[PDB]
Amino acid sequence: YTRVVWCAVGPEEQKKCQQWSQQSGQNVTCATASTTDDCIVLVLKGEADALNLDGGYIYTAGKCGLVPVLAENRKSSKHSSLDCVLRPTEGYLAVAVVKKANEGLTWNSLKDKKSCHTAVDRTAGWNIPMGLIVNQTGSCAFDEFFSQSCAPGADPKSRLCALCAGDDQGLDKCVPNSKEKYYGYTGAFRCLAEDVGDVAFVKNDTVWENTNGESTADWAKNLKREDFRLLCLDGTRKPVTEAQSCHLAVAPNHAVVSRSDRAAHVEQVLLHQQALFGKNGKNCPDKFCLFKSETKNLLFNDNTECLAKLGGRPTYEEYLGTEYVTAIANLKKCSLEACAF
Ligand SMILES: *[C@@H]1O[C@H](CO)[C@@H](O[C@@H]2O[C@H](CO)[C@@H](O[C@@H]3O[C@H](CO)[C@@H](O[C@@H]4O[C@H](CO)[C@@H](O[C@H]5O[C@H](CO)[C@@H](O[C@@H]6O[C@H](CO)[C@@H](O)[C@H](O)[C@@H]6O)[C@H](O)[C@@H]5O)[C@H](O)[C@@H]4O)[C@H](O)[C@@H]3O)[C@H](O)[C@H]2NC(C)=O)[C@H](O)[C@H]1NC(C)=O
Ligand SMILES: *[C@@H]1O[C@H](CO)[C@@H](O[C@@H]2O[C@H](CO)[C@@H](O[C@@H]3O[C@H](CO[C@@H]4O[C@H](CO)[C@@H](O)[C@H](O)[C@@H]4O)[C@@H](O[C@H]4O[C@H](CO)[C@@H](O)[C@H](O)[C@@H]4O)[C@H](O)[C@@H]3O)[C@H](O)[C@H]2NC(C)=O)[C@H](O)[C@H]1NC(C)=O
Ligand SMILES: *[C@@H]1O[C@H](CO)[C@@H](O[C@@H]2O[C@H](CO)[C@@H](O)[C@H](O)[C@H]2NC(C)=O)[C@H](O)[C@H]1NC(C)=O
Ligand SMILES: OC[C@H]1O[C@@H](O[C@H]2[C@H](O)[C@@H](O)[C@H](O)O[C@@H]2CO)[C@H](O)[C@@H](O)[C@@H]1O
Ligand SMILES: [Fe+3]
Ligand SMILES: [Zn+2]
Ligand SMILES: [Zn+2]
Numbered sequence: 174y175t176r177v178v179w180c181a182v183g184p185e186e187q188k189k190c191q192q193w194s195q196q197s198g199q200n201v202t203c204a205t206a207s208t209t210d211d212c213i214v215l216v217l218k219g220e221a222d223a224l225n226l227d228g229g230y231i232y233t234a235g236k237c238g239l240v241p242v243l244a245e246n247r248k249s250s251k252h253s254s255l256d257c258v259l260r261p262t263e264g265y266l267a268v269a270v271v272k273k274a275n276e277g278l279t280w281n282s283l284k285d286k287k288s289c290h291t292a293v294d295r296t297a298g299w300n301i302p303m304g305l306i307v308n309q310t311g312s313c314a315f316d317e318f319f320s321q322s323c324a325p326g327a328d329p330k331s332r333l334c335a336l337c338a339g340d341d342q343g344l345d346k347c348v349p350n351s352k353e354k355y356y357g358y359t360g361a362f363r364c365l366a367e368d369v370g371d372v373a374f375v376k377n378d379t380v381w382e383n384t385n386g387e388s389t390a391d392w393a394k395n396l397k398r399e400d401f402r403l404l405c406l407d408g409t410r411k412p413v414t415e416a417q418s419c420h421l422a423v424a425p426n427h428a429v430v431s432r433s434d435r436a437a438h439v440e441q442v443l444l445h446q447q448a449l450f451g452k453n454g455k456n457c458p459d460k461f462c463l464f465k466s467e468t469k470n471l472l473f474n475d476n477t478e479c480l481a482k483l484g485g486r487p488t489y490e491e492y493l494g495t496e497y498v499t500a501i502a503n504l505k506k507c508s509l510e511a512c513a514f
Contacts, residue, residue: 235489
């Protein structure tokens with residue numbers, strides 16, 4: 174029964190998984206794929222059991238019958254009395270971020286600028302900002318709004334990939350895994366920090382975690398919060414301290430998904446794995462920490478306090494919420510109810 178196959182996206186997640194596999198005594202083992210979509214296909218086939226997905230991929234997976242099992246829960250200020258595992262999730266803030274020094278760039282002058290996105294099909298990097306831009310321009314030509322972008326997972330020959338860098342060697346340009354230099358929350362924010370793009374579409378937490386010495390990475394060493402501004406939907410620009418009043422949307426947390434018939438068994442194993450390797454785990458500082466990987470967000474986001482039970486045993490639609498799923502569907506009309514595989 175009780176062995177789980179985790180699906181890793183790309184070589185760096187594979188290496189973290191192998192460490193996790195070793196430390197867990199083979200209670201968890203690892204399958205690897207090059208994209209999140211390929212990982213979803215392995216799960217459907219029964220060749221892997223589970224992986225942690227962004228809200229946008231939970232929508233893809235959900236249509237194919239996969240179900241949310243546990244959600245990432247980060248440290249909050251309210252609901253404090255309750256344990257992390259039983260605490261309701263709060264969601265994260267999708268923001269658009271620019272350099273202070275890039276004056277007079279607001280939400281209404283984004284057209285023909287250079288953009289940095291986490292990956293195609295992701296909540297804060299794609300679904301929210303592009304959904305808003307389609308609604309606002311009344312056009313599905315979102316591939317023509319920005320002059321140049323890095324949007325991992327789009328056509329490498331297109332302008333949506335012009336700004337992506339690939340790996341050390343310039344290989345794998347625009348692949349939607351951490352081999353691409355500008356992939357993910359951290360990568361899209363690096364794309365901005367290095368002045369490759371004019372705007373990054375990330376979440377509030379990314380700015381804080383990579384500025385003011387919170388990251389020791391070479392590119393983030395000297396970044397100061399005051400050098401950045403959030404774009405609000407009313408045309409204003411605000412300090413990064415003002416995210417609660419200047420965000421594009423609130424996003425549902427990343428969540429572990431699995432096949433419906435495997436859900437209960439994945440849940441049981443993961444709850445025990447976190448008692449051992451989670452934030453306060455028997456073995457975390459010492460042997461291995463599940464929620465660490467030097468700001469790279471491998472398998473799980475680094476700011477994760479725990480994986481939390483869901484409560485209300487929600488479907489993927491209830492988990493994502495009616496607001497979010499209607500945004501995705503309206504945007505999906507640009508690029509029809511059924512599994513994409
Ligand atoms: C955008 O993204 C940012 C990055 O994620 C994020 O900033 C992060 O915020 C969190 C908290 O929301 C910070 O975590 C905090 O760190 C501190 C120390 O660094 C930790 O130490 C203590 O933790 C205690 C337990 O939670 C905390 O008590 C909490 O609960 C009590 C209720 O009993 C309450 O305290 C009250 O304070 C009142 C105000 O003075 C006072 O009058 C009253 O009497 C009472 O004492 C608070 O709710 C309190 O939080 C202690 O106070 C300590 O804080 C702790 O673990 C805590 O989680 C991150 O450090 C911070 N990240 C960074 C890198 O700076 C933003 O919040 C995000 N913004 C938006 C808009 O979402
Ligand atoms: C891009 O634009 C598209 C098109 O406009 C947007 O899609 C629309 O999104 C709207 C908001 O998500 C959505 O509006 C509707 O809102 C009503 C009212 O919501 C209610 O809210 C109450 C809060 O007090 C709550 O208690 C209620 O339960 C309820 O949720 C919704 O209700 C309708 O249906 C009822 C049937 O039971 C009916 O009686 C009632 O009169 C309402 O008509 C409704 O479900 C919906 O949420 C609207 O549906 C969307 N339009 C289309 C064409 O799909 C995208 O969101 C935009 N994208 C982005 C990124 O912003
Ligand atoms: C591998 O999984 C097994 C089965 O869950 C674990 O063995 C159990 O561990 C618990 C608590 O540590 C004990 O109380 C049980 O008696 C054990 N036997 C069972 C339930 O089969 C084992 O701990 C796991 N190994 C690691 C390191 O994760
Ligand atoms: O409009 C009726 C609609 O209610 C749904 O509840 C949504 C709600 O609309 C949304 O604002 C919130 O964020 O998410 C919940 C779902 O968790 C319900 O899901 C639908 O069945 C229903 O059509
Ligand atoms: Fe996300
Ligand atoms: Zn809001
Ligand atoms: Zn329900």
